[PDB]
Amino acid sequence: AEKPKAHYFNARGRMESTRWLLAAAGVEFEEKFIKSAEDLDKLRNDGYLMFQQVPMVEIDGMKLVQTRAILNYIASKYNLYGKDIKERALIDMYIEGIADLGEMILLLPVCPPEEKDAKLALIKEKIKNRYFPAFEKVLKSHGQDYLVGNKLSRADIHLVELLYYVEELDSSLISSFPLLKALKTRISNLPTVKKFLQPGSPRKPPMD
Amino acid sequence: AEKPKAHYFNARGRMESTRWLLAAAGVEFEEKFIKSAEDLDKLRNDGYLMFQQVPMVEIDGMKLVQTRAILNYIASKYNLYGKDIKERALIDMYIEGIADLGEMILLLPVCPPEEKDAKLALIKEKIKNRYFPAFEKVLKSHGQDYLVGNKLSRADIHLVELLYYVEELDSSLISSFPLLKALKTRISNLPTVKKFLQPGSPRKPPMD
């Protein structure tokens, strides 16, 4: 009967995409926040962390670490990973590009200050030139409401999460992609995601 | 069966782990080498690279990009991804930890010659303190010949490939881990992997 338990810092970091996915799935979960280095040593010393790191999620009697391992398990368990191996391949290709873009945005605060300007420019170029056009093309190719299989999958969730982060970075970047704008609205208006986006959910704020 | 066709530089890089997995699965595949900037421009312009990047593999009607996407599909198609959602979860956790360590080694040649001694040292400390102990513990916990489900999976293949790279870095690192040494020998002796390690295969040499 035990709800999934997510162990991380009280912050977005590498746990946030899991919070979105669980919420979009309608899954009830607890969080246990790491507040001290003592908290983190105790997880380690208890053997909770296969590679000594968080995020870790306790779910269905496993102690899963590695964001991709957590997410793949959630996605399959809740029917958000496509109908078969070939839909899962499209999903994977899409969401690994999202992950590549997300990683650049995620690590930007820790970019060497003398590299920061150039890096920001390069990031926005890739959004405008590489990533946003790729996803708009997928959407234009089939004219369907969802990225894959005409049904909600983790790819729609991970993409719309990413679109919120790009909006924080620069709200003009999505301007010229109306199908992306339209997906953002539809997905944000799904009861589970609409509730997640409202004040009070486990959704975490940006880092200062 | 249209043979899968892998597009990459004639080099290990980001395609090497897919050549390992394909070869281990007994799958015959063709390669097409990118030799110049023009060669890559053509693939981009031709609409073959979803995110304008290689590796890309033509398989089963798809133009799959993103290493993880490419390998998840191959692993599922050739029954190297465990037999269920929970064995997949253990595989993903193991192989994501493998990718983290392997990413570090992969990028070691392209960092600044002063952030290099410290970076080499840190990699060695992670190998001896974090990664090899984790994998040794899995092998010792069941005593079985393979990481997961008592049967070859992509995890044994990804791990043993990484053991070859750790050996090129420092052949002393594996010395205190007798079960990883036994796995490397056993896996290297399977018919398909023995063939891959012998001359004249798609296996690629270190860069220089």
Side-chain angles (χ1 to χ4, degrees):
Chain A
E2 25 181 42
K3 314 199 283 180
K5 203 156 171 144
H7 299 257
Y8 203 60
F9 313 100
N10 189 2
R12 291 187 174 161
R14 294 190 180 292
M15 180 65 84
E16 190 75 354
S17 61
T18 297
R19 306 186 181 92
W20 267 81
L21 187 58
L22 284 168
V27 178
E28 192 68 11
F29 69 96
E30 319 177 30
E31 296 197 85
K32 193 180 194 323
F33 295 134
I34 294 152
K35 288 195 166 98
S36 44
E38 286 68 28
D39 289 336
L40 178 56
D41 285 318
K42 198 200 177 306
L43 294 164
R44 280 178 178 155
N45 291 330
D46 286 358
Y48 272 39
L49 304 186
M50 167 167 310
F51 302 114
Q52 311 313 314
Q53 302 157 268
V54 298
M56 190 268 276
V57 178
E58 294 184 65
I59 178 172
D60 294 332
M62 312 183 289
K63 293 182 166 68
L64 286 186
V65 297
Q66 306 284 345
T67 303
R68 292 184 175 82
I70 294 171
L71 284 174
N72 292 353
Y73 184 81
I74 298 165
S76 292
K77 176 172 175 80
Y78 302 93
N79 304 303
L80 289 162
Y81 216 167
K83 69 177 176 30
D84 54 43
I85 185 183
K86 284 194 179 188
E87 290 189 347
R88 176 209 171 131
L90 303 179
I91 286 166
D92 279 336
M93 164 161 60
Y94 303 175
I95 71 190
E96 289 301 316
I98 287 154
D100 286 351
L101 175 53
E103 184 81 359
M104 306 169 196
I105 292 169
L106 174 70
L107 294 187
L108 194 45
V110 165
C111 175
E114 71 284 14
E115 291 173 17
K116 205 177 288 138
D117 286 348
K119 181 64 203 162
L120 188 60
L122 169 70
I123 293 172
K124 303 176 166 197
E125 282 321 322
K126 292 183 174 165
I127 287 161
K128 297 177 257 204
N129 296 326
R130 179 174 285 189
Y131 295 102
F132 280 11
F135 295 107
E136 185 84 359
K137 181 171 173 200
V138 170
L139 297 167
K140 184 161 196 238
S141 73
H142 59 48
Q144 289 164 349
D145 284 352
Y146 308 94
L147 287 172
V148 172
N150 216 356
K151 147 182 219 279
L152 177 68
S153 71
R154 63 187 295 195
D156 310 295
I157 304 306
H158 299 318
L159 178 51
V160 169
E161 182 189 10
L162 172 69
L163 298 187
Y164 280 90
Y165 305 148
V166 175
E167 187 189 36
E168 288 169 349
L169 183 79
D170 185 340
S171 63
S172 78
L173 290 163
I174 199 181
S175 279
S176 71
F177 306 93
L179 299 170
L180 289 177
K181 295 193 224 178
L183 177 68
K184 196 185 175 207
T185 300
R186 278 187 309 268
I187 293 310
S188 296
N189 284 267
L190 294 175
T192 54
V193 181
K194 183 183 201 177
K195 181 175 218 166
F196 190 72
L197 285 159
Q198 295 175 343
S201 71
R203 191 171 62 103
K204 296 298 176 285
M207 177 159 80
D208 41 28
Chain B
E2 64 268 37
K3 282 185 202 293
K5 172 150 163 216
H7 302 261
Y8 205 61
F9 309 111
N10 186 1
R12 281 180 177 174
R14 292 194 177 281
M15 178 62 89
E16 201 55 9
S17 68
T18 298
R19 312 179 174 99
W20 268 78
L21 185 59
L22 279 173
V27 179
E28 283 263 351
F29 69 96
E30 294 188 344
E31 291 192 278
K32 189 214 168 78
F33 295 130
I34 295 165
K35 300 128 195 179
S36 63
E38 172 160 62
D39 288 48
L40 182 58
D41 287 332
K42 197 181 182 326
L43 287 174
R44 292 173 171 168
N45 294 336
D46 287 356
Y48 274 50
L49 306 177
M50 187 167 177
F51 301 107
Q52 308 320 319
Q53 294 158 262
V54 292
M56 183 269 277
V57 165
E58 304 186 67
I59 186 170
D60 288 339
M62 294 171 304
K63 279 42 180 145
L64 289 189
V65 298
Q66 304 291 152
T67 294
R68 298 191 178 63
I70 289 172
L71 300 172
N72 295 343
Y73 184 73
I74 295 162
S76 288
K77 168 176 187 89
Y78 296 107
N79 292 335
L80 287 169
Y81 218 158
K83 88 190 168 48
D84 61 30
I85 183 177
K86 283 186 163 169
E87 289 186 349
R88 281 208 302 286
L90 289 174
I91 297 183
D92 284 330
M93 164 172 60
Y94 302 171
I95 71 184
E96 290 290 303
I98 295 159
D100 283 355
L101 177 48
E103 184 76 4
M104 291 164 187
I105 294 170
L106 175 73
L107 294 179
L108 200 41
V110 293
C111 79
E114 307 92 333
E115 276 145 56
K116 170 87 156 51
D117 283 345
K119 250 312 201 156
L120 185 64
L122 201 132
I123 295 178
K124 300 206 198 182
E125 172 193 32
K126 296 299 176 40
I127 287 159
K128 60 202 178 58
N129 293 150
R130 176 166 298 177
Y131 291 103
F132 284 7
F135 292 114
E136 185 87 354
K137 184 184 176 185
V138 179
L139 294 170
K140 188 185 56 108
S141 77
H142 51 56
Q144 288 173 341
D145 286 349
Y146 306 100
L147 292 166
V148 172
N150 204 19
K151 200 191 210 220
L152 191 58
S153 74
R154 68 185 291 196
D156 303 294
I157 295 306
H158 298 330
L159 179 60
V160 159
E161 180 190 13
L162 176 63
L163 300 181
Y164 278 89
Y165 309 151
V166 180
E167 177 173 288
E168 289 170 0
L169 201 60
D170 187 339
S171 62
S172 82
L173 298 184
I174 203 171
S175 53
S176 68
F177 303 100
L179 295 181
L180 285 171
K181 299 178 20 197
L183 175 80
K184 181 177 181 268
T185 299
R186 279 193 311 268
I187 296 295
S188 290
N189 279 289
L190 294 178
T192 54
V193 171
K194 192 168 159 206
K195 196 187 160 89
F196 190 62
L197 290 158
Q198 285 171 348
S201 75
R203 186 176 62 111
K204 300 289 184 276
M207 189 89 93
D208 66 324

